[PDB]
Amino acid sequence: IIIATKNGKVRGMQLTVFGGTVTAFLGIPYAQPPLGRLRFKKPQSLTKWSDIWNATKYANSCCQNIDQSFPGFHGSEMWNPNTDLSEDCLYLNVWIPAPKPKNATVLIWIYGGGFQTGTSSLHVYDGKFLARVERVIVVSMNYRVGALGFLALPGNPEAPGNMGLFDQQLALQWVQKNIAAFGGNPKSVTLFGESAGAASVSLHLLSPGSHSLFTRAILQSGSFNAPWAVTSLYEARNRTLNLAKLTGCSRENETEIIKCLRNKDPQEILLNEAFVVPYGTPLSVNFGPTVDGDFLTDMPDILLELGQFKKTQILVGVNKDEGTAFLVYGAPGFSKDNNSIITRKEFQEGLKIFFPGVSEFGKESILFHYTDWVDDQRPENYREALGDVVGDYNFICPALEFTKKFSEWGNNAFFYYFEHRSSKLPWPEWMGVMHGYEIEFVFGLPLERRDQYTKAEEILSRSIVKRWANFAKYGNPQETQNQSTSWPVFKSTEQKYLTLNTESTRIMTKLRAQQCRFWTSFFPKV
Ligand SMILES: *[C@@H]1O[C@H](CO[C@@H]2O[C@@H](C)[C@@H](O)[C@@H](O)[C@@H]2O)[C@@H](O[C@@H]2O[C@H](CO)[C@@H](O)[C@H](O)[C@H]2NC(C)=O)[C@H](O)[C@H]1NC(C)=O
Ligand SMILES: *[C@@H]1O[C@H](CO[C@@H]2O[C@@H](C)[C@@H](O)[C@@H](O)[C@@H]2O)[C@@H](O[C@@H]2O[C@H](CO)[C@@H](O)[C@H](O)[C@H]2NC(C)=O)[C@H](O)[C@H]1NC(C)=O
Ligand SMILES: *[C@@H]1O[C@H](CO[C@@H]2O[C@@H](C)[C@@H](O)[C@@H](O)[C@@H]2O)[C@@H](O[C@@H]2O[C@H](CO)[C@@H](O)[C@H](O)[C@H]2NC(C)=O)[C@H](O)[C@H]1NC(C)=O
Ligand SMILES: COCCN(C[C@@H]1CCCN(Cc2ccccc2)C1)S(=O)(=O)c1ccc2ccccc2c1
Ligand SMILES: *[C@@H]1O[C@H](CO[C@@H]2O[C@@H](C)[C@@H](O)[C@@H](O)[C@@H]2O)[C@@H](O)[C@H](O)[C@H]1NC(C)=O
Ligand SMILES: *[C@@H]1O[C@H](CO[C@@H]2O[C@@H](C)[C@@H](O)[C@@H](O)[C@@H]2O)[C@@H](O)[C@H](O)[C@H]1NC(C)=O
Ligand SMILES: CC(=O)N[C@H]1[C@H]([C@H](O)[C@H](O)CO)O[C@@](O)(C(=O)O)C[C@@H]1O
Ligand SMILES: *[C@@H]1O[C@H](CO)[C@@H](O)[C@H](O)[C@H]1NC(C)=O
Ligand SMILES: [Cl-]
């Protein structure tokens, strides 16, 4: 029940899962609380304790604004933090199989939330099912988000940027130093993450200081080359300065600006984060990763293009309707409570919302590419077009490009297209296979027969869980036993991918070929 770690003993707790047992250590601290003079700095090392730390409940989530767009609605509130917010939030969680494994592969989860939100204690991130079913160890950590995790004054150690990424990296280090005492294998560590968590995973593939801290990587609906994932050094300075003005902290000595921000209460930094950008969109990332000269030594597109990244296997994928979620967070004519049949003029207004700083010609060119109808009379033509615009631009085409460029250097890559709409999905049917709604399948929640999932969804989750665990253990996401479709490597020439659904699991080629040539080759010019 008690494990001796390098910094002290921790006590866990037994859980009953599927007529078996999983041992959970929830809320192990992995860094000095980043409080007081430590706000905005890289995370400092933890000094030992002599007692027994009680890791029996999730710890505080990091400070963050909350999505209040749909109070009482499970489809949005399932993503909101479910422990107290606090600056004292640098904790991690460990689920280990019972009986204690001898040398188990480790899966480390990095949550998303646009780098402004998220917490590892969400119900859909519960590691106990993977530990029970596949006898892997699951680790997840809280890392700082928003300005408190990514405020950037480049070169200045008082606020260097990328602190939340260094939070993640310090937790990977904790697993290297400590997971063998839990029965884990530090030489067999796979990172997995979704959305900004997947963008985070991809940046660890680029960061030389993370290279020795993991083996393989899984990227679910995200990568660093997505247009929302990396803040420019220009915007980062303008945003840090605007935050200073907003809080009466404008100074000329930049270090004195940080000292002033260190005396504001967390809630007043949070309230001014929104307005540091003049025209925001539903995908705005106020404070995110930057090229800091430390974690990130050059523009990541250059590093990707020139093969400067960890050479290992990757698993990458996207969902069929990545873009629809964002339409109900600002696009005119849209509502989760009706079928959102919009007109051409609403479509055009919708592009102004998603591409506010883009030239008139740029917006026309999106319209031109996405309105060549196979039928001009379908009432939902425009509703679907805007969704595909948002999802192709922001998730699908960047993930396909990352996979192509990464595989060109000789590593096995595997790409999936997830197209199952959850039977339990609280959002309306027109929104489809939404961003974030593969996660519960990856974590094995449909394996729990009590929870109203269909039988077909148990089978699909069961096969996904097996493929993810085989990728982490062996670098190869096959299900070898139940006459399953074999998953081929993704090569830049043939570009084969695997579709994931309850019906027919098929091999297909060149996902969104025509749409992505527009986003990837032409649109960057406008
Ligand atoms: C636990 O297992 C490791 C081997 O891990 C495997 O090899 C990795 C390279 C990676 O591909 C993982 O996914 C694999 O599961 C053992 O590591 C060995 O350690 C000895 C130490 O003397 C070393 O000489 C060997 O070269 C290591 N093997 C490899 C393949 O590098 C480790 O000893 C095992 N520990 C326990 C307690 O079982
Ligand atoms: C960079 O920052 C300036 C300042 O932003 C304004 O003040 C901040 C404190 C914050 O409250 C923002 O919401 C404000 O917009 C931006 O310049 C402003 O731009 C808006 C609209 O473009 C304009 O109405 C204001 O008059 C401008 N104010 C000043 C002082 O110039 C600027 O757009 C930001 N972005 C870039 C790329 O420079
Ligand atoms: C779908 O709903 C949107 C959103 O309107 C709100 O939600 C509805 C479910 C209902 O509760 C309305 O009373 C709410 O206003 C509708 O978009 C609005 O349309 C009106 C006129 O068409 C326009 O003046 C508003 O600005 C629109 N609001 C927004 C936020 O864009 C839309 O018309 C509905 N579509 C249908 C019923 O097909
Ligand atoms: C208080 O925070 C306001 C801003 N964000 C809220 C999210 C906006 C999108 C919807 N999320 C809920 C949700 C619904 C449906 C399916 C999944 C998820 C809430 S955010 O900071 O979290 C954010 C920012 C920029 C991102 C860019 C790319 C992808 C995700 C992003 C999230
Ligand atoms: C940490 O927890 C210790 C033990 O808690 C008790 O025993 C275990 C087996 C569980 O059954 C738990 O629910 C019980 O409450 C306490 O004795 C100790 O005081 C705790 N330490 C602190 C600092 O709170
Ligand atoms: C594989 O299928 C199991 C149920 O099917 C039965 O068992 C397999 C091994 C075959 O012999 C088949 O003819 C049987 O009908 C599931 O219980 C099991 O979880 C599945 N495994 C995976 C990884 O999906
Ligand atoms: C955010 C925060 O610091 N919460 C703390 C809570 C609350 O202060 C009280 O339960 C009242 O809400 O108290 C603890 O003793 C607990 O019960 O686990 C420690 C925990 O850290
Ligand atoms: C700014 O302040 C710091 C400490 O408060 C000091 O070390 C530094 O020299 C100052 N620089 C300027 C340009 O005032
Ligand atoms: Cl390693």
mmCIF file of C-alpha atoms in Angstrom, residues 116-236:
data_model
loop_
_atom_site.group_PDB
_atom_site.id
_atom_site.type_symbol
_atom_site.label_atom_id
_atom_site.label_comp_id
_atom_site.label_asym_id
_atom_site.label_seq_id
_atom_site.Cartn_x
_atom_site.Cartn_y
_atom_site.Cartn_z
ATOM 1 C CA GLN A 116 -5.559 27.654 -21.230
ATOM 2 C CA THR A 117 -7.623 24.947 -19.495
ATOM 3 C CA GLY A 118 -7.632 21.294 -18.509
ATOM 4 C CA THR A 119 -6.967 18.922 -15.624
ATOM 5 C CA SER A 120 -5.836 15.325 -15.247
ATOM 6 C CA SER A 121 -8.686 14.450 -12.864
ATOM 7 C CA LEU A 122 -11.412 14.489 -15.537
ATOM 8 C CA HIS A 123 -13.590 11.368 -15.548
ATOM 9 C CA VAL A 124 -12.662 10.648 -19.186
ATOM 10 C CA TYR A 125 -8.935 10.538 -18.234
ATOM 11 C CA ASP A 126 -9.324 7.834 -15.555
ATOM 12 C CA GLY A 127 -6.370 5.477 -16.001
ATOM 13 C CA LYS A 128 -7.746 2.546 -13.977
ATOM 14 C CA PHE A 129 -9.271 0.726 -16.968
ATOM 15 C CA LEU A 130 -6.035 0.634 -19.014
ATOM 16 C CA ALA A 131 -4.075 -0.592 -15.993
ATOM 17 C CA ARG A 132 -6.659 -3.307 -15.308
ATOM 18 C CA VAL A 133 -7.143 -4.522 -18.881
ATOM 19 C CA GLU A 134 -3.661 -4.190 -20.422
ATOM 20 C CA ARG A 135 -1.428 -4.313 -17.306
ATOM 21 C CA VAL A 136 0.313 -1.078 -18.269
ATOM 22 C CA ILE A 137 0.993 1.708 -15.787
ATOM 23 C CA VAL A 138 -0.821 5.000 -16.456
ATOM 24 C CA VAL A 139 0.598 8.357 -15.364
ATOM 25 C CA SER A 140 -0.975 11.792 -15.853
ATOM 26 C CA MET A 141 0.069 15.223 -14.552
ATOM 27 C CA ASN A 142 -1.314 18.705 -13.998
ATOM 28 C CA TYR A 143 0.701 21.440 -15.682
ATOM 29 C CA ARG A 144 0.236 25.203 -15.627
ATOM 30 C CA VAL A 145 -2.015 26.742 -18.274
ATOM 31 C CA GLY A 146 -2.836 30.216 -19.490
ATOM 32 C CA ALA A 147 -0.630 33.151 -18.565
ATOM 33 C CA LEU A 148 0.556 31.404 -15.374
ATOM 34 C CA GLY A 149 2.017 28.618 -17.523
ATOM 35 C CA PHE A 150 3.036 30.372 -20.726
ATOM 36 C CA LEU A 151 3.594 34.099 -20.141
ATOM 37 C CA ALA A 152 6.622 34.998 -22.262
ATOM 38 C CA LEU A 153 9.448 37.470 -21.768
ATOM 39 C CA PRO A 154 12.042 35.692 -23.919
ATOM 40 C CA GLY A 155 15.429 35.240 -22.251
ATOM 41 C CA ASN A 156 14.104 36.444 -18.885
ATOM 42 C CA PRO A 157 14.151 33.579 -16.308
ATOM 43 C CA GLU A 158 11.495 35.430 -14.246
ATOM 44 C CA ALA A 159 9.005 34.668 -17.082
ATOM 45 C CA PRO A 160 10.789 32.761 -19.882
ATOM 46 C CA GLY A 161 7.758 31.115 -21.465
ATOM 47 C CA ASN A 162 6.873 27.441 -21.870
ATOM 48 C CA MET A 163 6.659 26.901 -18.082
ATOM 49 C CA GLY A 164 3.714 24.500 -18.488
ATOM 50 C CA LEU A 165 5.801 22.469 -20.934
ATOM 51 C CA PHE A 166 8.634 22.402 -18.406
ATOM 52 C CA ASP A 167 5.996 21.280 -15.885
ATOM 53 C CA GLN A 168 5.167 18.341 -18.189
ATOM 54 C CA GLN A 169 8.888 17.639 -18.696
ATOM 55 C CA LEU A 170 9.578 17.594 -14.949
ATOM 56 C CA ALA A 171 6.838 14.991 -14.496
ATOM 57 C CA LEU A 172 8.385 12.848 -17.256
ATOM 58 C CA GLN A 173 11.603 13.140 -15.245
ATOM 59 C CA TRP A 174 9.780 11.994 -12.090
ATOM 60 C CA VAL A 175 8.706 8.850 -13.952
ATOM 61 C CA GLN A 176 12.294 8.166 -15.037
ATOM 62 C CA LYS A 177 13.601 8.522 -11.468
ATOM 63 C CA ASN A 178 10.695 6.831 -9.668
ATOM 64 C CA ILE A 179 8.479 4.533 -11.744
ATOM 65 C CA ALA A 180 10.699 1.443 -11.252
ATOM 66 C CA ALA A 181 9.681 1.501 -7.577
ATOM 67 C CA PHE A 182 6.063 1.146 -8.776
ATOM 68 C CA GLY A 183 6.916 -1.813 -11.018
ATOM 69 C CA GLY A 184 7.237 0.280 -14.160
ATOM 70 C CA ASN A 185 9.861 0.193 -16.889
ATOM 71 C CA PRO A 186 11.433 3.660 -17.403
ATOM 72 C CA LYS A 187 12.896 2.353 -20.687
ATOM 73 C CA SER A 188 9.346 1.736 -22.069
ATOM 74 C CA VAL A 189 7.436 5.037 -21.760
ATOM 75 C CA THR A 190 4.871 6.190 -24.313
ATOM 76 C CA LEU A 191 3.484 9.727 -24.174
ATOM 77 C CA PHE A 192 -0.108 10.196 -25.289
ATOM 78 C CA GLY A 193 -2.242 13.321 -25.457
ATOM 79 C CA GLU A 194 -5.178 14.933 -27.226
ATOM 80 C CA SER A 195 -5.654 18.406 -28.780
ATOM 81 C CA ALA A 196 -3.214 20.764 -26.982
ATOM 82 C CA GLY A 197 -2.000 17.660 -25.151
ATOM 83 C CA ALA A 198 -1.116 16.098 -28.517
ATOM 84 C CA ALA A 199 0.530 19.360 -29.587
ATOM 85 C CA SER A 200 2.477 19.048 -26.324
ATOM 86 C CA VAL A 201 3.538 15.492 -27.176
ATOM 87 C CA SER A 202 4.785 16.660 -30.567
ATOM 88 C CA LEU A 203 6.849 19.428 -28.937
ATOM 89 C CA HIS A 204 8.514 16.876 -26.642
ATOM 90 C CA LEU A 205 9.579 15.038 -29.827
ATOM 91 C CA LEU A 206 11.290 18.308 -30.821
ATOM 92 C CA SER A 207 12.754 19.314 -27.455
ATOM 93 C CA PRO A 208 16.261 17.878 -26.908
ATOM 94 C CA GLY A 209 15.768 17.961 -23.142
ATOM 95 C CA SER A 210 12.821 15.536 -23.424
ATOM 96 C CA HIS A 211 14.524 13.023 -25.724
ATOM 97 C CA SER A 212 15.815 10.706 -22.987
ATOM 98 C CA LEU A 213 12.543 10.871 -20.989
ATOM 99 C CA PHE A 214 10.301 8.766 -23.278
ATOM 100 C CA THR A 215 10.260 6.043 -25.971
ATOM 101 C CA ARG A 216 7.247 6.476 -28.316
ATOM 102 C CA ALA A 217 4.438 8.936 -28.909
ATOM 103 C CA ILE A 218 0.709 9.065 -29.638
ATOM 104 C CA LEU A 219 -0.901 12.274 -30.987
ATOM 105 C CA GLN A 220 -4.706 12.449 -30.845
ATOM 106 C CA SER A 221 -6.236 15.381 -32.847
ATOM 107 C CA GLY A 222 -3.239 17.707 -32.487
ATOM 108 C CA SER A 223 0.324 18.609 -33.471
ATOM 109 C CA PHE A 224 2.617 21.615 -33.001
ATOM 110 C CA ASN A 225 2.173 22.752 -36.634
ATOM 111 C CA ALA A 226 -1.549 23.403 -36.117
ATOM 112 C CA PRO A 227 -2.187 27.164 -36.534
ATOM 113 C CA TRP A 228 -3.314 27.581 -32.874
ATOM 114 C CA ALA A 229 -0.439 25.672 -31.262
ATOM 115 C CA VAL A 230 2.595 28.021 -31.178
ATOM 116 C CA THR A 231 2.498 31.728 -30.268
ATOM 117 C CA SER A 232 4.836 33.971 -32.254
ATOM 118 C CA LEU A 233 7.481 35.935 -30.370
ATOM 119 C CA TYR A 234 5.805 39.070 -31.758
ATOM 120 C CA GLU A 235 2.363 38.286 -30.348
ATOM 121 C CA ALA A 236 3.883 36.949 -27.117
#
